[PDB]
Design a binder for these strands. Structure first.
Ligand SMILES: C[C@@H]1CCO[C@H]2Cn3cc(C(=O)NCc4ccc(F)cc4F)c(=O)c(O)c3C(=O)N12
Ligand SMILES: C[C@@H]1CCO[C@H]2Cn3cc(C(=O)NCc4ccc(F)cc4F)c(=O)c(O)c3C(=O)N12
Ligand SMILES: [Mg+2]
Ligand SMILES: [Mg+2]
Ligand SMILES: [Mg+2]
Ligand SMILES: [Mg+2]
Ligand SMILES: [Zn+2]
Ligand SMILES: [Zn+2]
Lengths: 47, 70, 261, 242, 261, 47, 242, 70
DNA sequence: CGGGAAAATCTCTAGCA
DNA sequence: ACTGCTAGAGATTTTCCCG
DNA sequence: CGGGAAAATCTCTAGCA
DNA sequence: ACTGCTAGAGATTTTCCCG
């Protein structure tokens, strides 16, 4: 599996780990605390 | 008949990008245009570029320059 | 590499040393030090250094609002060409946006519009307008202006032009229209050395022409190909290479191991 | 190259336009244009019509692209020079408007419209328009029930007319027709620009007298000499400016 | 090329067409169109696309204030090494800055300090402190934070580290000192794979050692060289190349056309 | 001589032309309206 | 290479430190360290002393780097554990403090100072400090008239002592001496790190029994076999991990 | 005497930059150190770098690695 | 084939707020 | 399941042009 | 000399506000 | 007369290691 850490929206605090549901060209879809979010890969790190 | 249409469709120029490079690749030749993909020839190289990354024009200045002629 | 690992883990829990420091100070190989750093949530504070690419299909427009002298300017840009439309609107509301958008859709073939999540663009009125005009709505990731990078850039360009010609008009709306004219027809460059107006004309005309030509070719030409599997459909044969489609998958193969029926 | 004689024969036997000879025989457009121009015997896109109609007690300013039938209409608060000038400025910014035809109404003759035409570089000269207005009213009546204000209905009618009404020689819509016409006009402008660029030079081949330059190639140069078009290699030809 | 120029000039005065548009629409060569654009004040709206480079001499420190949780943190960085010092101060004032600066000057050889134009850094008290400690003061171009890039970057780094350890301390000052420790000794990378503390030690020690060695060499070695002009002073000879100093100018010449006396 | 057009300090409006007194690695010194100013080369254009 | 015998002879005739043998004969420090450690007969940088002095009814916390004489002094509002812990944390952040020596005062024995030493990884163990305090008081008195507050005078005195007072074997300042000592300590730590990295591998040369690995160069390998150091071509030697 | 000091001064490593490139050039060799200039050797190339663009260190890890030895 | 000017391509930046 | 870009200022590299 | 893992170098980004 | 930089995340390129 993958651990994703992300900077959600105007919040300077990084969050995660979140599950990686999907990975695209310039964005990813993740699930954190049973909440689906869409994050630019600029604002995400996958491990 | 078919040859004329193929030559016409090959007269068009394509400017595209690769998945990781932001600069636009020069005027490649158009071979096939689909709903979501364009097959182009770029210096003896045949590439399939997704539709969302291709700008297809018939550059009119070059057309009137006669560059398409052999 | 066990006692070193334990000492490095304690040192990291206290200080969050990076992998180089731990590798140096605890005789650890880089892989294990990096694993230590990677297993710590508190040290994941940076996203991958890259940029995506926006959609540039012939039918996509990017819309955004901008502000100048206390007035709201609605701006649309045809992504493929850089051709812009703009106008002052009294209020940054869904009704004015929907009227602007219906106007745009009646003058150019707008298949999709891409915007940020400003309230005016998410209003039900704009949704109804898009539904009537057969327009698909795409919203960027919230608070990610890069997703609208084209129109944002054009916001910078339009404003610049507006500053060049602000003294030729009494009212800001006239200056906005003057700047739209200047950008669309009096600035040349980019792909084809065109202006945005000629570029958009060329792009749309090329779309129609290539669609018709490909339709005629498909009507006339029909063949099946077997390559290194099922009966794929040929698209272009020549130069020792053949391009085929098999179950919505386009592949280019050498002339060898390819039979055309 | 090696097809100029065929082009001349085809022009004599058909008097076809330069585009047909350039495409069929694969010749540079400059060469074909010179060929067609030589024969003495065989010797619009930017024109718009403006009008104001009335419906439901409101003024609708309508602009028609004559060559294409493409329509741009807007409800204006009042039939004044300022509103017309703003509408015309917008139209010019969005399409290559070269000439506007009006009906001598006070708004169109206003100094505001004159200033707008001057800045935009548009020329003003005082039954397509009336029929267009008739069809626009028909569409507005058809779609009036789906809207709440007149301006929205007018925009919906413009949309339907420009992109949803197909009919004519090829069954195209007005939008496609105007796009094609403007593309052809751009082609023509580019051809004229390259003719202007090329015609300023002279060529001496093999040494014969000065000759008109037509086309320069990688290893071939096409020139004209006394109503005769010839192909000469670059090494044997010298190109100068006078 | 005189008829097109007038029309292009009028067209530009109205629209400010760029040089490509004028060259296309008036049969003008690129040079003349560019000259038209260059002669217009209203079209000069963009500076040259480049970046300078900050001074990185061994004696320069970059100082700046930053804010966190409603408190002021004064931060200094040794440019050559990236070694930082920091502390919370109750007020963003010249007195506290001068106390901080005198402290720093007594613990490391501070020859020059580079800061922005914040009031605390321009105060007479800080000037007096620098005068007493023999410190030269450099101020960046106002509202050009890039001139203090290093320290600005370090601000970002410091804050990051603070966020990593903020829960290990009750007070912000303790967290600041913890972050200073972590940066100076627990983060390795950059030049030499060092930490900032090791790097600064190496930089300063190398400065002293090379100064002494060069002084001894100059005391022992003394020669004059003639190349091509005058009796220049040799600095290093060998490998088919001679380095000389003449009129406070350093020149590297091939072994040919060079005589050493 | 040289004409310099520059963006001065937090003011988005470009100014000039100003005389070029001096040109450095990453900055220039100019004279506009009898006032000497120092501008990063990023914020200046010399003609 | 080809200087190990000379290094051994020099050590026998002088018993010089490994640095001298490495520098004189141009040998890798690992080889010289092995040579010097082989002979049984021939077989501090991070130590600080803390104290609190008093002047003008104010508490001054003074830290002395024993090896170098380099001082860091502050005026603290109160002789409390919290102030001492903050001072120690700062010192540790600015210099590689390994151990601190105190006089058993209440502030130094406080749980706060113990926590600070634990987090910073400092070891605490309860006539240099007194002499340094006397010198600091002398300097403060000399410069007391140039300032207005005691803290400023204390910092000026620290500056003068660390960088303006020269005297000793080479006439160097305390700042220079501490920089040199810390540089030497880094040198030593890196040497130890590479010795630790290399000691985990064994070498078989020409096939003889396992031998200790000392250096792996670009075209030769320096090893030790039964208190004898030898050079081997790379091809003839195999290095493995046990 | 002089040779030993020259070799020692040449043991030092220099990291520098050119006037228009922001990345730091690798560990060149030190030849001469002046008030405002440092003369370095970088792959058989002798360059004069201004003082404000040079970081001069004796990389201690490399020194203990014996890399300075022949 | 040899140089020089021109044209083209490449590199890099601010502002969009 | 989505995504930085635009246009201008210099720098540098091909390319064309007469011997 | 041949491949593969590792080490090194290269490319690129946010945040400093 | 002064000047963007830092450190981390991947990508790609040398370099070392046993046959
Ligand atoms: C209330 C709506 C909806 C929610 O988001 C806000 C805030 N916002 C912010 C920027 C902005 O920060 N632009 C600067 C910028 C920075 C980087 C880049 F790549 C492109 C850029 F334009 C906008 O442009 C913008 O339109 C909005 C906006 O509309 N809204
Ligand atoms: C009142 C003082 C004196 C006058 O100037 C102001 C405003 N200012 C602004 C920034 C700032 O905008 N930083 C962001 C940033 C942007 C780009 C970049 F390259 C580096 C960067 F740090 C500062 O950091 C800063 O210290 C100050 C400051 O102190 N002052
Ligand atoms: Mg917006
Ligand atoms: Mg915006
Ligand atoms: Mg500041
Ligand atoms: Mg700052
Ligand atoms: Zn951590
Ligand atoms: Zn202008």
């Amino acid at each position: 599996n993958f651990r994703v850490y992300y900077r959600d929206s105007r919040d300077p605090v990084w969050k995660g780990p979140a599950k990686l549901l999907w990975k695209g060209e310039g964005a990813v879809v993740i699930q954190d605390n049973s909440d689906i979010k869409v994050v630019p890969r600029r604002k995400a790190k996958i491990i | 008949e078919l040859q004329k249409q193929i030559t016409k469709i090959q007269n068009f120029r394509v400017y595209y990008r690769d998945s990781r490079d932001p600069v636009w690749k020069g005027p490649a030749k158009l071979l096939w245009k689909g709903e979501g993909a364009v097959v182009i020839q770029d210096n003896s190289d045949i590439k399939v570029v997704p539709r969302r990354k291709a700008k297809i024009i018939r550059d009119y200045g070059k057309q009137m320059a006669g560059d398409d002629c052999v | 590499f066990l006692d070193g690992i334990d000492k490095a883990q304690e040192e990291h829990e206290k200080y969050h040393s990076n992998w180089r420091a731990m590798a140096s100070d605890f005789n650890l190989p880089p892989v294990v030090a990096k694993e230590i750093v990677a297993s710590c949530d508190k040290c994941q504070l940076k996203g991958e250094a890259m940029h995506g690419q926006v959609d540039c299909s012939p039918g996509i427009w990017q819309l955004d609002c901008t502000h100048l002298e206390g007035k709201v300017i609605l701006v649309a840009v045809h992504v493929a060409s850089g051709y812009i439309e703009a106008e002052v609107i009294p209020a940054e509301t869904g009704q004015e946006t929907a009227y602007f958008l219906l106007k745009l859709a009646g003058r150019w073939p707008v298949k999709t519009v891409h915007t940020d999540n400003g309230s005016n663009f998410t209003s039900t009125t704009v949704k109804a307008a898009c539904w009537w005009a057969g327009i698909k709505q795409e919203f960027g990731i919230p608070y990610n202006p890069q997703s609208q990078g084209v129109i944002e850039s054009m916001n910078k360009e339009l404003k610049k032009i507006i500053g060049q010609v602000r003294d030729q008009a009494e009212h800001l709306k006239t200056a906005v229209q003057m700047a739209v004219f200047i950008h669309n027809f009096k600035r040349k460059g980019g792909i084809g050395g065109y202006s945005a107006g000629e570029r958009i004309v060329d792009i749309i005309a090329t779309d129609i022409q290539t669609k018709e030509l490909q339709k005629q070719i498909t009507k006339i030409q029909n063949f099946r190909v077997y390559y290194r599997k099922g009966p794929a459909k040929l698209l272009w044969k020549g130069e020792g290479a053949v391009v085929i489609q098999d179950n919505s998958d386009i592949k280019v193969v050498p002339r060898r191991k390819a039979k055309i029926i």
